[model samples]
Target: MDKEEAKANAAAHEWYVAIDEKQVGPFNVEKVKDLWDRGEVGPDSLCWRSGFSDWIPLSETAELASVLAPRPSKPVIVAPEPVSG
Candidate 1:
């Protein structure tokens, strides 16, 4: 099973988030999503976890990457080859 991406989204309470110069949380992944749903935070915001060297953008964090922007920058519009049955 291709569970690498799926396993990255763990429900842990060790995430820190930042908004511009302001910083907040020790929140879980779920709480971060709550902030995203509200007007408080978005893809532009940054987050940190237990092992991260620095606060990373929500759009880049694995647990919330899809929530922030599933495919914001990718350009994969080409269709696959048609089956020849």
Candidate 2:
């Protein structure tokens, strides 16, 4: 999938669809958790960033990794309230 398509589809999941040659996530969804639970995968495992996009080893970014580790920047909670509120 292209960046826009992947970004929309993977939005709610904890998966970051990456792009080639960029240290940062291309599409911006977090995939760490998904791979971890899938077994045979870990922080350093590699997967196709996008189908035919290229293989990217799961190397967490210092800033982004913190989110996965629940470190300094722990996940941000942004639950939407009722429209009336």
Candidate 3:
């Protein structure tokens, strides 16, 4: 698909950065950065344009933003903050 189409497609998915109405890609957080570094596209670059709206780089919509492997099923525990008063 073309650039516009790609951006639109990306927006349809969960946690995407479809600013206006175009398909950038089914990109994750890391991939977005990679794309920026590779000079494929910039955050403010016009991904799509229309009469009513235009798509540009907003915040990169990310899910949990996987850093390493998938987390375990067990939930991590933490204590409550101590009251100062």
Candidate 4:
């Protein structure tokens, strides 16, 4: 399949992520990004999909580059303390 078609096809299928000898996911591409964004998955995390011959690190997967790209840090919001009586 062409790159664009392959991306669409991959996006349609769920992906599996392996962690601590446990299997996680049937997650779609967007969900994988969510996990990555939340720090649940990282560059060295192992992942696999239906057409793959074997599991591979996310960093080794070209298609996942965007998912693994660095995200901007969110600003922390601090609530103001009530004035002491």
Listed in order, each prediction's TM-score against the native is 0.50, 0.29, 0.29, 0.58
Over 12-34, each residue of candidate 4 has an lDDT whose tens digit, in order, gives 76777778777776877666666
- In model 4, the Cα lDDT at residue 3 comes to 60
**By summed lDDT, which 10 consecutive residues of candidate 1 come out lowest?**
3-12
Residues 1-85, model 2: lDDT tens digits: 5466444655544334433433444333345544444532444544444344654445533543544443243566556883222
- Per-residue lDDT tens digits of candidate 3, residues 11-53? 4333334434545544544455555555454454333333326
Report the C-alpha displacement of residue 36, candidate 4, in angstroms. Answer: 0.2
Off by over 4 Å in 2: 1-11, 14-40, 70-85
Give the local distance difference test score of model 2. Answer: 0.44
Q: Candidate 3, 81: how far from true, in Å?
A: 47
User: Model 1 segments beyond 4 Å from truth?
Assistant: 1-11, 61-63, 67-85
Deviation in Å, model 3, residue 75 alpha carbon: 48
Per-residue lDDT of 1-85 in model 1, one digit per residue for the tens? 6554333556445767676777665766665566666655646567666787876666554767555435335564545873222
Output candidate 4 Cα RMSD.
12.5
**lDDT score for candidate 1 against the true structure:** 0.60
Compare the candidates by TM-score and give the number of the best one: 4
The stretch of ten residues in a row with the least summed lDDT in candidate 2 is 13-22
Candidate 1 TM-score versus the reference: 0.50
